[PDB]
Structure formats: structure tokens, C-alpha cells
Amino acid sequence: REIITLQLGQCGNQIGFEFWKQLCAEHGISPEGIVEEFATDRKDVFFYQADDEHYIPRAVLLDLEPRVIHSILNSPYAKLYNPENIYLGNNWASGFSQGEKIHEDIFDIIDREADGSDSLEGFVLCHSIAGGTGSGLGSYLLERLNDRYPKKLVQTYSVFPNQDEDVVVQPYNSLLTLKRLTQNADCVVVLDNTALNRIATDRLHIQNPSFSQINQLVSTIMSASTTTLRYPGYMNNDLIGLIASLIPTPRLHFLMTGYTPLTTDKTTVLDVMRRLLQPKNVMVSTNHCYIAILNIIQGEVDPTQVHKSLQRIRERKLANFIPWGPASIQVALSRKSPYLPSAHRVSGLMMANHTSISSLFERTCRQYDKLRKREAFLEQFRKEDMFKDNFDEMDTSREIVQQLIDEYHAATRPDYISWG
Amino acid sequence: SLKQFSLRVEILPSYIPVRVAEKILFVGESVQMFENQNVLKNQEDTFAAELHRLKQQPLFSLVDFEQVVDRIRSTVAEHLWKLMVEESDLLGQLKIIKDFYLLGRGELFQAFIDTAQHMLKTPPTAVTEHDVNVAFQQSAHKVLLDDDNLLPLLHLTIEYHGSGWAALGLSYKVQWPLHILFTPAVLEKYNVVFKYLLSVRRVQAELQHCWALQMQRQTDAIKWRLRNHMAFLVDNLQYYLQVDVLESQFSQLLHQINSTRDFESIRLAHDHFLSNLLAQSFILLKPVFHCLNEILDLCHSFCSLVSQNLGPLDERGAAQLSILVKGFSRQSSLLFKILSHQINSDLAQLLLRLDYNKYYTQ
């Protein structure tokens, strides 16, 4: 149903601001909120129907030692939102300890925004793992959402720190936050710095300003994933029914996210499905195969081509899956948005669970272990000491992700009556 | 009137062909439903002159008579098509019927299912038909058509005394002088398919509420194999199949009624449209219809197991779970034999559970 973006982390606040200006350009709205004269469709998934048809976006801004709010303040997006929703470190443990003492008023902010909405179903998070301020505070917020709301959803659109081995404290923080995301979040959409950066270097001619184009890529991905919710289709437009088909394995909830236009500047659905199953078009980094696949096609589509494309895709064995059930590739259709300022309105998306992400997780399972053996990169921060005296929480996270690896490899088998 | 009395062969000369008589039926019944409500009337004298000319011929031949009747019928169908599409909004009436009987707006009915299950039990003859109509119209009055919809009178199987969620009636009174395309039998058949589509929407909605297993919740005979996951993916895929068959027939209907200018062709397209919807949504008796009935029963019994357990706990639920896995395998090969008629919606899938044959060999 209706979901409220909780932005946290520096890149998380960047993709939150980019997402709101993307939705301001997408919908027929002013930068005050007033309805335009070119804008019935639904505008109630992220926007409250406020005073003068002011579609005020429902959002939560969280950070520590504020940086980006100045860029919000001198912009016309301090006149679109903020009726009072903006709240003002460098390690997971420092962020955890800082979020421990101010858990009351941030939980009051969550309660205020839950009372502000009209139908609460899930809390979507626009977050960056090891963004600085996001690490630790984000995991503690995930623990608070799991403890206080077991009946609602926790969605995490997130990028994960991979530099292909830069920063020597981020594998500890990412593994601990990944354990918190397994136990305290309901669905994770995984993205990577190397995958988005490599595709950005491919489709463009940049290498240094990676952040500003990663904001555009993540905003387009998030708008494509919520296109069928914001603009009315008639399939599974609640978040619960949409993610219900998307997760085949109840512990393996990390989803591949491809996008057939890497740059948005003719084609059939067969060709973009053949494109979309290739990992080079996917922004996500032995026997690896999917468990269940679903794809969403929006544009100037002929539905009988969706028929023949599904027929040929599953029969030519490019949907690669050996499940313990019948779980399969799924087609889905969406209506492309009226009054996009973007041209070339044919666009495709895939949301599938693949075991190949386990190999990328194994790199993190290497890195922490490697940095535990050299012992000059745990850095002996005192906040890590007061977090846990035995430092066995990192071993617990390693155990949880090792169970995750064994569950991926058991889901490759036709039996899931045994995992390691 | 349309309380008309039909033209049959105890009373027709048997040398006159029948098809001319149903065309004359069409012409006269439109004259019946404009004689009343005055508190095709521009060319009636031409029709009377042609009938007088037909009277004047002493040796009648049938082929000239058929040509004269066709000449009358073309202008009759043109006038009726122009009047009924423009002034009484035939496309709007088809949209209303699609939204309420064929569930083209399934959002309001999904919220109505969210507010009521107690007519999984049975009605006694006083009371609950009022309750379904009041609750449905109020839940429609929250948002999305507040201005209207206080006009469908919700009846389930409330003739009273039987379940009803596979048996919800619907009576919506059409404009009889302005729309003779809709008959009581046509609305009756729409009512049956409305019952059928209600049942599948109920079972999928309950199973995604248990997908809150995932908002909330030991291996090997606790986690009901999470067969919540094994069951919901395949039921949701069949739900998408009923989705794309309903849109394919409705879009073909709107293009077909826009293309032609004779109201008889509108009626042929309309009857073909409803017959295809009945054949393709598995209302017709086939082993595919047998498969969908069993998959409804399996989903209902499965939701009854998984609702009351909250988290993973063995409540002697494995005894139910064995029946669930065995029926799961039996309807597994049966959705294989669903799975492609020669119709693109029902054809859309015999690759979709046939690939790695976990349901062909299991």
C-alpha cells in the first residue's frame, strides 16, 4: 500500500532528495505541491492530499552532523515538504551508540509519520551501507522497526560497499548491518558501488563524480519498481502482494535488479527479456542459477508479444533455475507514466532471486576474516568495545551469512529439506 | 415493452426462413421500446411503403423479400447504434459492467473481502443481504467513486440457506428503453462469472496476508515447508492468467464496437465476448475447471492451517501438511494440463510450470 521513505546515510539522503525531485518531475506537480494544468490517477502512495491539492511527500530525514540539509534549505524543495520532518558518525559502533541515546525522539518521529499516513503497510528505506552517518544508526533503526512493527513491512533500497579492495572499516560495518538486515528487515534490494560505477563508466565518460549519477540510477530504479504502485495498474499494487511473488526462498530475499535502458536516450519484449536476463545489463555483481524470476514491462507494449516472449524465454532455457519447487519466471505488465518528461517510454525491469549474489557476499565473508587475521583494520575503536566485550557479534554475523550461503547452495538443489 | 412475445414456427409459415424472422424481431422490439416513455421515427413511412409493395406482389419470391428486409434492417441497425452509443453511453455501460461483474476495478471488491468472511458461513432468511450491501457501499464510499455506486444492490446466494464467496450475486438495473443490448440472461451469466472471480480474489488475498509470515516470523516439519512460499507463487501466476484473459476480451470488445456501425454486429460481438470469457475463464466443464476447483479448496484449507499458528510452531500441523503436499502434487500435474483452447491467455503458460518437471515427475 502506502510506504514512507526513511532516508539515512549521505548517499541515502542524496538518493532521497533525487527521488523526490524525480517524482516532482514525474508527476504533474509544482515545487510547492500545487496541482498543475497538465496533470484520475492515484497520487496517494507517497503524497498526502494536503491543503490546496498540495501533494506533500511523506518522508523521514535522519542523519548525524548535518551536511545535505543546507542544500535542501536553499532550494525550492524546502517549500515542497518539511512541515517538520527533518532531524539533524563514521563507524557502525559510534552510530549504534549515538542512536541508542536518542531512540525515543526518532521513534516519536516514526510514530508521527505513521499517524500522518492514512494506510500504513510498510516502511521503505532509502539507505547507503557505510555512507558514514548511515552505518549503525540504520541498523539500530532496523532493530527498532522489527521490535515495534512486526506487522508491517521493512523495505530497503540500498547500495553495498564494494571497492574491489579503499576503506578498511566498511566490511565490519556492512557485515553487521547485513546481519541486522537479515533478522530485522523484510526485503532487501541490493546494489553495489562497483556494478553501478562500472555501468556508469560504460554508458558515460566519467570516473570521479560517481555519486551524482548513482543518485540518478537509483532514483530511476526506485521509480520503476514503484511505477505500478504509484500509477494504477491492476496487479498486486499493494507492496505485500507484489513482494509476495518476488521472494521464493524465505531467507534468501536479496533480489536482482536489472534495467534494459542503461541510458534512456524499435524493440520487442523478447529482445529486452534476452537483454534483461544477461548480468551485464543488471546493476548487481560454479553452479549459479535463479530460484524465481519476475519481470515488469512498461511502455508501448503489445500483450500477445508478452505471451510469445514468455513462451520462448522459458522454452529456450535462458531462465536458469533448479528449484525445490516449481518456482519459475513470471511476466508482469505496467502502464508507462502519462506526462513523463523522459522520452523513449519503453523500459524493462527484473526482480529475481539469484544465488550468484552469494559469491559477492563471500567476498565480504573473506574480507572481515582477512581483516580479523591481520589485526590493524578492526582499529580497536572504544565504541566497538562497549558494543560487545567479546567481539562475538561479528562472529554471529559471519555465522548468519554462512547459513545464508549454505541456504543459497541448498536452494540450487531440488531439496530444501536439508540446508547446512 | 420488451414483455414482447417471440416469433416462432407454430405460427410462422415454414417456407419463410428463420433468420429473416429474428431480424424482424430486432426491428419490432426497438419499436416496442420507444412507444412507451413519450410522457427510427423518420423513416417509418418508407417501411410501411415497402410493406405495402410486398403486399402488392401476387407471386411472392423469398429472395426479393430477404433483400427488402435487409434494406430495412441496415438503416434500423444504423439508427440504433448511433443512438445507443452516443446518447446513452454504451461504452460507459460496458465499463460499469466490466468494473462490477467482471471485476475490472478489483480494488474496491478486494477491500470488501478484507472486511467480511462471515458469509463463508450460511444465510438465514432475514438479515445478511442488507449487511453485504451496506458494508460494500460504505467501503466504496471511503474513496474511489464516492459520488456513485449506491446503485448495485449486493445479493450473495441470499435466496438464503446454502457458503457464498463463490456465489455472490449482483443486480444492476440497466436503462431498458435506451439499452436493449443487455438482457436478463446476459446479466445472469455475468453474475455467475462474477461469483467465480470473487472466490479466486478471496483466496489469493488471504494467502498474501499470510505473506506477513514474512513481516513477522526451526527447520524440518515446522516451517510448513514455508509452503506458503511454494503455494503462493503458483496461485498468483494463475491469478495473472485470469487477469490477462479478462483484459484481452475487453479490449477486443471495445475496438470491435468502435469499428462497426450496425447494432446487430455489436450484439454478435457482445455474445461472442461473453462466450469467450466463459470458455476461457474455465466456466465451461473441463478437467481444467476441475483443476481450478481443487486449487481453490487447497488454498482455502491451507490458509486455515497457516493463519492460527502465528510463528513457526508444531501444533500437530504436519498431519494437515501431508494432505497439503499430496494435493499440491495432484493439482501440480493438473495445472500442467491447464497450462495450454488454443487461446493466448490459456496458452500463455504450459511452459510456466513445465520446465524442470518437479511437477511432472513428482
Residue numbers in the entry:
A (entry chain Y): 3 to 41, 45 to 93, 101 to 177, 180 to 279, 287 to 306, 313 to 447
B (entry chain K): 253 to 291, 300 to 422, 448 to 502, 509 to 631, 636 to 657
Article sentences:
Here, we used cryo-EM to identify and characterize γ-TuRC assembly intermediates after recombinant expression of the complex, which allowed us to delineate a comprehensive stepwise assembly pathway from a stable 6-spoked core to the mature 14-spoked γ-TuRC, identifying successive stabilization and conformational locking of γ-TuSC units as central principles in the assembly process.
Coomassie-stained SDS-PAGE and immunoblot analysis indicated successful copurification of GCP4, GCP6 and γ-tubulin with 2xFLAG-GCP5 and negative stain EM in conjunction with 2D class averaging showed reconstitution of a 4-spoke entity.
